[PDB]
RNA sequence: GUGAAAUGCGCAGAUACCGGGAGGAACGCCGAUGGCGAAGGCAGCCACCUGGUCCACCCGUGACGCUGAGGCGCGAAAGCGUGGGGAGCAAACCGGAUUAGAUACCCGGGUAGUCCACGCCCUAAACGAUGCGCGCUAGGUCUCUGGGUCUCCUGGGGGCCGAAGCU
């Protein structure tokens, strides 16, 4: 297993219920592809540099996880099916590297 | 008929000719002019003096439909580009601001041969 | 994959046949649902009205399912991929949990053992069928109804697909295998994926029998007949039509559009 | 990749005397493992010519060595090859 | 005038989510800035840009902004 | 649009502006006299598979080495075969210009091709015009990348100036 930082951007204009569904589906998804949830930081709605999907806002989710390397590509695909999930980004985790060290 | 005092004006200055199109606050044109719209025709249309004459002839029409302040927005290098701005500030329009939005690829599609002189 | 043969005979030099990896482990068709005897017959009440049809291997018909909304919510396992003489695509026999069995025109990717299911609920994956509204804009998809509840009409030729292009009210924009762009109703079902057996285009028939085996009789050129017989007919020794090419019936056949002008199908089409 | 463990197990499994990390016999079994793992890879990515180069470089090494091994010792030359499955 | 590395504290040029930290490395044209201005090292200016890019793709940073009064 | 033009497009509503959509190619800034690769060559971001390389620790094998006729593989672009794609660009091809002439140079179009896959082709100012491995023979200067009880010392790589010597 390798460590990975998941990024997922959801519709801004969502009732917290649908937003929960989507986020509950993401748990199944994480779960099924062999992902042990580590951290998780919900910085929530944020203003965007450029409009995504006609919207200048977006709802963000970071996620530390540990999972098997192989299935990750698939998870990213399975996370993208959804109409509401507008962006996904996997990233192998490697510990902060500091300037003015 | 329709009038608005607060609008917006776009400057297209090509290495050939300069043409100004004045709009509403969301970009729907009200009137325009250019180096062709004056008595000039050919490569004199690219001259800055013509870009001026246009810019004035352009402004002068917008006033008539109530115009007073406009935001200015340029696209593209060209002799007449500067004289264009200049010609609007001192003209009876309040140049509320300027922007440059000359479009420019992030290494897009291959340009013609004349332009691909940059190896 | 397309088998090519060594030239131990002319003709068998150009001939190529299908791989049958496709289908393996199931040939005799399903006595149960599968068969109605199929009726060979190259015309209506007396007169031939499609020229050059006849002969060709005696053939049994497999009764497929083109309306999957019967079995909404019931999943089925894909039990086998088998050969269908009656169309270019191959077919998959699938046993519903229901007990009940049926044949679907087998989409690409589909493999024995998979489970497959139809409904608004269904996962957006291979072989599953869904209203067009609940299918994500961009996916390719085949065996598409054209009006809701009327049966799958589009995209069933071997290796065909359509692509969801956009939404628009109760309707939904579709790029067809032709290249046409057509609104189709949201409730019109369609099965995710494309069709498969897509090497089908590349069979090289190989000789002129074979063409006969598939029941295609020889086709005699226009000029090649006499004037009674055809517009091009006639001319002392060999001839150059003599303006402008025409069917036996006379109507022009180079470029002349034939679709009906005031068709209410219009307004729905755009290419 | 080839893990720490898979690596070690091979090594402790082919040693001459625990601790022996080099040695003809082991060096070989390292490559063999890398090779097959690599062999297996190029079989999918046929178009990966660059990585194919390395294989040919190892293949030599393996050879190079085996010829030494055989020259000094016919006895544990059979041992290795047979308890490892090569000679094509 | 202002060297930008010196004008911050300890900061992790690996975090493609410190908009505030990163924002300052982006002209008023949205470009990546040179070492003539960041004053990062070779090695730094790299591990920098790669994260700046990502962050653009996440929707945090602009790829470009148009140029206010010129 | 040019040198100035003309062909060409446009009152059948173009150019200029705004919104909504389609599609293909190439990845601005970072980016450099920078890096990687045996060569050809390799540049948006992500993940997976995988090659070569460098430093340190002095632990193991114990000369297991260097080169390599022939063989075998790779080999830019163009070009070929089958099928897909085709926005931009563009041999051929056509129009306008110029000119004595203009099968060119400049302008308006434009077909292969450019791209994908799969298989061929095997060339080149394939150039450092400098085969590979090793040992030996002043230093100065700036740079990439590692290791140090880090004004510096040490190892690997990329440029410039130059001892001896060679020419």
UniProtKB/Swiss-Prot annotation, chain B:
Pfam families xrefs: Ribosomal_S11
Ranges of Basic residues composition bias in the record: 109-119
Keywords carried by this UniProt record: Ribonucleoprotein, Ribosomal protein, RNA-binding, rRNA-binding
Gene Ontology CC entries for this record: ribonucleoprotein complex; ribosome
Disulfide partners: none
Gene Ontology terms describing biological process: translation
One function term, GO molecular function aspect: rRNA binding
Region of interest called Disordered, as start-end residue ranges on this chain: 99-119
Oligomer status and interactors: Part of the 30S ribosomal subunit. Interacts with proteins S7 and S18. Binds to the C-terminus of IF-3; however exactly how IF-3 interacts with the 30S subunit is unclear. May contact the C-terminus of Era.
Described function: Located on the upper part of the platform of the 30S subunit, where it bridges several disparate RNA helices of the 16S rRNA. Forms part of the Shine-Dalgarno cleft in the 70S ribosome, where it interacts both with the Shine-Dalgarno helix and mRNA.
Similarity remark: Belongs to the universal ribosomal protein uS11 family.
Protein name stated in the entry: Small ribosomal subunit protein uS11
Organism: Thermus thermophilus (strain ATCC 27634 / DSM 579 / HB8)
Gene from which this protein is expressed: rpsK
UniProtKB/Swiss-Prot annotation, chain C:
Disulfide linkage: none
Function of the protein: One of the primary rRNA binding proteins. Required for association of the 30S and 50S subunits to form the 70S ribosome, for tRNA binding and peptide bond formation. It has been suggested to have peptidyltransferase activity; this is somewhat controversial. Makes several contacts with the 16S rRNA (forming bridge B7b) in the 70S ribosome.
Compositionally biased spans, kind Basic and acidic residues: 229-239
Biological process annotations from GO: cytoplasmic translation
Family from the record: Belongs to the universal ribosomal protein uL2 family.
HAMAP family: Ribosomal_uL2_B
Name this protein carries in UniProt: Large ribosomal subunit protein uL2
Any GO CC annotation of this UniProt entry: large ribosomal subunit
UniProtKB/Swiss-Prot annotation, chain D:
Key word Translocase present: no
Protein's GO biological process: translation
Entry keyword annotation includes Hydrolase: no
CDD domains in alphabetical order: Ribosomal_S15p_S13e (cd00353)
Molecular-function GO term, any one: structural constituent of ribosome
Any Pfam family matching the protein: Ribosomal_S15
Gene Ontology CC: cytosolic small ribosomal subunit
InterPro entries documented for this protein: Ribosomal_uS15, Ribosomal_uS15_bac-type, uS15_NS1_RNA-bd_sf
Keywords: Ribonucleoprotein, Ribosomal protein, RNA-binding, rRNA-binding
Family to which the UniProt record says this protein belongs: Belongs to the universal ribosomal protein uS15 family.
The protein's assembly and partners: Part of the 30S ribosomal subunit. Forms a bridge to the 50S subunit in the 70S ribosome, contacting the 23S rRNA.
Biological role stated in the UniProt entry: One of the primary rRNA binding proteins, it binds directly to 16S rRNA where it helps nucleate assembly of the platform of the 30S subunit by binding and bridging several RNA helices of the 16S rRNA.
Protein name from the UniProt record: Small ribosomal subunit protein uS15
Species this chain originates from: Thermus thermophilus (strain ATCC 27634 / DSM 579 / HB8)
Chain's gene name: rpsO
UniProtKB/Swiss-Prot annotation, chain E:
Swiss-Prot/TrEMBL keywords: Ribonucleoprotein, Ribosomal protein, RNA-binding, rRNA-binding
Record GO biological process: translation
A GO cellular-component term linked to this record: ribonucleoprotein complex
Transmembrane stretches, start-end: none
GO molecular function: small ribosomal subunit rRNA binding; structural constituent of ribosome
Superkingdom of origin: Bacteria
Assembly mode: Part of the 30S ribosomal subunit. Forms a tight heterodimer with protein bS6, also interacts with protein uS11. Binds to the C-terminus of IF3 and to the central section of Era.
Stated family: Belongs to the bacterial ribosomal protein bS18 family.
Biological role: Located on the back of the platform of the 30S subunit where it stabilizes the close packing of several RNA helices of the 16S rRNA. Forms part of the Shine-Dalgarno cleft in the 70S ribosome, where it probably interacts with the Shine-Dalgarno helix.
Protein name: Small ribosomal subunit protein bS18
Originating species: Thermus thermophilus (strain ATCC 27634 / DSM 579 / HB8)
């Amino acid at each position: 297993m390798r460590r990975y930082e998941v990024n997922i951007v959801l519709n801004p204009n969502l009732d917290q219920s649908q937003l929960a569904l989507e986020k509950e589906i993401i748990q199944r998804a994480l779960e099924n592809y062999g992902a042990r949830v580590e951290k998780v930081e919900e910085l929530g709605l944020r203003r965007l540099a450029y409009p995504i999907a006609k919207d200048p806002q977006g709802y963000f989710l970071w996620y530390q996880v540990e999972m098997p390397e192989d299935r990750v590509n698939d998870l990213a695909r399975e996370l993208r099916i959804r109409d509401n999930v507008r962006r996904v980004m996997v990233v192998k985790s490697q510990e902060p590297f500091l300037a003015n060290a | 008929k329709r009038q608005v005092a607060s609008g917006r004006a776009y400057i297209h200055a090509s290495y050939n000719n300069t043409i100004v199109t004045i709009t509403d606050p969301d970009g729907n044109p009200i009137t325009w002019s250019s180096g062709g719209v004056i008595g000039y025709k050919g490569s004199r249309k690219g001259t800055p003096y013509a870009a001026q004459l246009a810019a004035l002839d352009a402004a002068k029409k917008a006033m008539a439909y109530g115009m007073q302040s406009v935001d200015v927005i340029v696209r593209g290098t060209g002799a007449g580009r500067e004289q264009a701005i200049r010609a609007l500030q001192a003209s009876g329009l309040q140049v509320k601001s300027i922007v440059d939005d000359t479009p420019v690829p992030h290494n897009g599609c291959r340009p013609k041969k004349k332009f691909r002189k940059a190896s | 994959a397309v088998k090519k043969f060594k030239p131990y005979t002319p003709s068998r030099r150009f001939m190529t046949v299908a791989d049958f990896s496709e289908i393996t482990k199931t040939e005799p068709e399903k006595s149960l649902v599968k068969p109605l005897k199929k009726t060979g017959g190259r015309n209506n009440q007396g007169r031939i009205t499609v020229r050059f049809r006849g002969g060709g291997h005696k053939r049994l018909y497999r009764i497929i399912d083109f309306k999957r909304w019967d079995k909404v919510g019931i999943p089925a396992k894909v039990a086998a991929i088998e050969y269908d003489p009656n169309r270019s695509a191959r077919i998959a026999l699938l046993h519903y949990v229901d007990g009940e069995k049926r044949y679907i025109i087998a989409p690409d990717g589909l493999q024995v053992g998979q489970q497959v299911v139809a409904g608004p609920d269904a996962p957006i994956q291979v072989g599953n069928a869904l209203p067009l509204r609940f299918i994500p804009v961009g996916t390719v998809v085949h065996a598409v109804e054209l009006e809701p509840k009327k049966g799958a009409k589009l995209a069933r030729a071997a290796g065909t697909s359509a692509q969801i292009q956009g939404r628009e009210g109760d309707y939904v924009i579709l790029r067809l295998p032709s290249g046409e762009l057509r609104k189709v109703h949201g409730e019109c079902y369609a099965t995710v994926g494309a069709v498969g057996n897509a090497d089908h285009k590349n069979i090289v028939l190989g000789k002129a029998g074979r063409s006969r085996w598939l029941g295609r009789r020889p086709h005699v050129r226009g000029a090649a007949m006499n004037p009674v017989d055809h517009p091009h007919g006639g001319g002392e020794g060999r001839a150059p039509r003599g303006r402008p090419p025409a069917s036996p019936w006379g109507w022009q056949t180079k470029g002349l559009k034939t679709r009906k002008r005031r068709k209410p199908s219009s307004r729905f089409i755009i290419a | 990749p080839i893990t720490k463990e898979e690596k070690q197990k091979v090594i402790q499994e082919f040693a001459r005397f625990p601790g022996d990390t080099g040695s003809t016999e082991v060096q070989v079994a390292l490559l063999t493992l890398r090779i097959n793992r690599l062999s297996e890879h190029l079989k999918v990515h046929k178009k990966d010519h660059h990585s194919h180069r390395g294989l040919l470089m190892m293949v030599g090494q393996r050879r190079r060595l085996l010829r030494y091994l055989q020259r000094e010792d016919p006895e544990r030359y059979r041992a290795l090859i047979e308890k490892l499955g090569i000679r094509g | 005038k202002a060297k930008v590395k010196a004008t911050l504290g300890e900061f992790d040029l690996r975090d493609y989510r410190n908009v505030e930290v990163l924002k300052r490395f982006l002209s008023e044209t949205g470009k990546i800035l040179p070492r003539r201005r960041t004053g990062l090292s070779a090695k730094e200016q790299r591990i920098l840009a790669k994260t700046i890019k990502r962050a653009r793709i996440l929707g945090l940073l602009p790829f470009t902004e148009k140029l206010v009064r010129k």
